[PDB]
């Protein structure tokens, strides 16, 4: 300094920038002189720091509590900042390709590439000065258990204080992030709710946000997340998706390792065996609900580790070993009940942030599909702060509100969640919603069926049926044909014990239109199949499309009388269909980059189909 500009010291209000690591006072004091913090609060993690902040926010109207429950708090959205917005998401890289296949006919549904320039261009025009007049928080955060060889370590920095909040629930925050980091490196995260003050543009509803600004960039040759202009979820908590799929399932591509957007779950049978299984389901599809399943079966156990992304390595041993990376549970709320999800009612009453949910005039909270009866006298607010009752249409919670809460609070979290070395995955299940033609549950015939089983999946969003490979299309952090070919590589890993990989269909509905099978407890039933089948258990007939189960062969006992063979019905015709429909998909979407494999597999399918 030949003046005194540049250092923003006299600004820090918790912490200091002389304690941080070299390059993480580069990263918060390069971006405090562009965006021109009023002050800087470097997090601790600490609850002190937690409560004050809920309190302050509280204070501002920018949160209430709900004083029915334990430590619980409500924000709701300005409507226009209410879920991830795909159409405003980017990566950036040199070449298009290396993000996203070219398609031959239409435009790519498997990724946004921006140009580096392009993306200068658009950061210049939001982020200098944005934070003026606000504090920029400086969050350490650490995805996957501190000291684990699979944990990456990232620094936010946000304008948001419900960003602080939800990050300590989401990630491990605070001191000791920084001081395991030391000078290793980190991914760096921006955000900022693009609201400088004095504010241009009216307040609404106490949340701050800018959506014909709003960006979210990611540039993995930089180890960049840039975001700018929502406040929501996958938008802001940038560790969760930004972060934990789409900057690190390119790491993974790099490191020979796998970055999913899959639950990790334990069962154990009646005789102690225990086993981990991943599933990736898109959405409305009930990965929550898996992963927190409430058995059926007697005897039977299931465990969470988490249930949404899960990072996977092979061992020198070749077991396939993963962890969660997230430190809570950002779940939808509505459809969430005693019924679909208890363990989830369980964990969710303490020290829990709602988002668009309905509260009750005692201080609870409502949404559709939560199957409570209100005491009479007892009052209901939606999501829009508006008196409301059950004879309205619109909806009292937002479709896709949610609740963020602590993963050590599920009364049935595993007891290796947050084991270093991960666990041992011996099965991988897709799924999504069809109404028709497809099965309860069948297995692929090999790993490389298996990956095009991951690579074909469709599921309901007139209906509309898309497609949604590997739970992964808003996701993917790289070209989807590549992401294809590192999956089928796994297979000439020496000593790799690869697992089996099942595909899963909850929600197939008779000529009637009601569903076929009763489901969420009910689904350890299908658990235990598989279980049997990864034990090298006889329980299995060849089909056309994989293995299914022999008759009698899943337990059925204490269900009705279900109909097992509109469940299990496998038709030609619509076989016939479901392939030309997906080998069209992957010729236009994938491209040049289709795996010659992926092509075998569709070939294969299609020969299957057509003999019977
Ligand atoms: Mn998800
Ligand atoms: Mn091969
Ligand atoms: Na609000």
């Known amino acids: 300094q030949l003046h005194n500009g540049l250092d923003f010291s006299a600004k820090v209000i918790q912490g200091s920038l002389d304690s941080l690591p070299q390059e993480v006072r580069k990263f918060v004091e390069g971006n405090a002189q562009l965006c021109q913090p009023e002050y800087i609060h470097i997090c601790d993690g600490s609850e002190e720091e937690y409560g004050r902040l809920l309190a302050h926010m509280q204070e501002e109207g920018v949160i209430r509590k709900l004083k029915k429950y334990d430590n619980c708090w409500l924000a709701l959205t300005d409507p226009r900042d209410v879920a991830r917005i795909e159409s405003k998401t980017v990566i950036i890289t040199q070449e298009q390709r290396d993000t996203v296949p070219i398609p031959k006919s239409g435009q790519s549904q498997l990724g946004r590439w921006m140009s580096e320039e392009d993306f200068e261009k658009a950061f210049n025009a939001r982020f200098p000065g944005c934070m003026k007049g606000r504090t920029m928080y400086v969050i350490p955060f650490s995805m996957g258990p501190l000291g684990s060889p699979l944990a990456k370590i990232g620094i936010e920095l946000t304008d948001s204080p419900y960003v602080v909040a939800s990050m300590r629930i989401m990630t491990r925050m605070g001191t000791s992030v920084l ?56 938008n802001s908590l940038l560790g969760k998706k930004c972060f934990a799929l789409r900057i690190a399932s390119r790491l993974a591509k790099e490191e020979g390792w796998l970055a999913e957007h899959m639950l990790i779950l334990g069962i154990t049978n009646p005789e102690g065996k225990k086993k ?32 949404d992304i899960a990072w996977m390595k092979f061992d020198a041993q070749g077991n396939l070993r993963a962890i969660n990376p997230e430190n809570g549970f950002f779940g939808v709320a509505p459809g969430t009940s005693v019924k679909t999800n208890p363990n989830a009612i369980k964990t969710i009453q303490k020290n829990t942030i709602f988002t668009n ?12 599909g939560i199957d409570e009866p209100l005491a009479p006298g007892v009052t209901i607010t939606s999501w829009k702060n508006k008196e409301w009752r059950p004879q309205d249409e619109e909806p009292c919670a937002h479709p896709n509100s949610r609740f963020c809460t602590p993963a050590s609070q599920c009364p049935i979290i595993d007891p290796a969640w947050e084991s270093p070395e991960g666990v041992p995955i011996e099965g991988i299940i897709f799924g999504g919603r069809r109404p028709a033609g497809v099965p309860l549950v069948y297995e692929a015939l090999s790993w490389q069926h298996g990956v095009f089983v991951g690579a074909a999946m469709r599921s309901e969003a007139g209906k509309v ?119 069209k998909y992957l010729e236009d979407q994938v491209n040049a980059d289709l795996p010659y494999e992926i092509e075998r597999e569709l070939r294969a399918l299609k020969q299957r189909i057509s003999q019977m």
């Open 179 to 234: 001081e395991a980091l030391g000078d290793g490196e980190f991914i760096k995260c921006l955000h900022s709710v693009g609201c400088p003050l004095p504010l241009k543009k009216p307040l609404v509803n106490n949340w701050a946000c800018n959506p014909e600004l709003t960006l979210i960039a990611h540039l993995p040759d930089r180890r960049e997340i840039i975001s700018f202009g929502s406040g929501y979820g996958g």
């Open 276 to 307: 981990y299984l991943a599933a990736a389901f898109p959405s409305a599809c009930g990965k929550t609900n898996l992963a927190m399943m409430n058995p059926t079966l007697p005897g039977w156990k299931v465990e969470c580790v988490g249930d």
């Open 357 to 368: 949910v309905a509260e009750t005039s005692d201080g609870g909270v409502y949404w559709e």
């Open 465 to 583: 049926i898309m497609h949604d490979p590997f739970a992964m299309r808003p996701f993917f952090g790289y070209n989807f044909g590549k992401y294809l070919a590192h999956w089928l590589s796994m297979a000439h890993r020496p000593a790799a014990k690869l697992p089996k990989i099942f595909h899963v269909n909850w929600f197939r509905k008779d000529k009637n239109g009601k569903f076929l099978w009763p489901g969420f407890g009910e689904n350890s039933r299908v658990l235990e199949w598989m279980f049997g089948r990864i034990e090298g258990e006889d329980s299995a007939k060849l089909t056309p499309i994989g293995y299914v189960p022999k008759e009698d062969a899943l337990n059925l006992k204490g269900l009705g009388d279900v109909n097992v063979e509109e469940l299990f019905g496998i038709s030609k015709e619509f076989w016939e269909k479901e392939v030309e429909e997906i080998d």
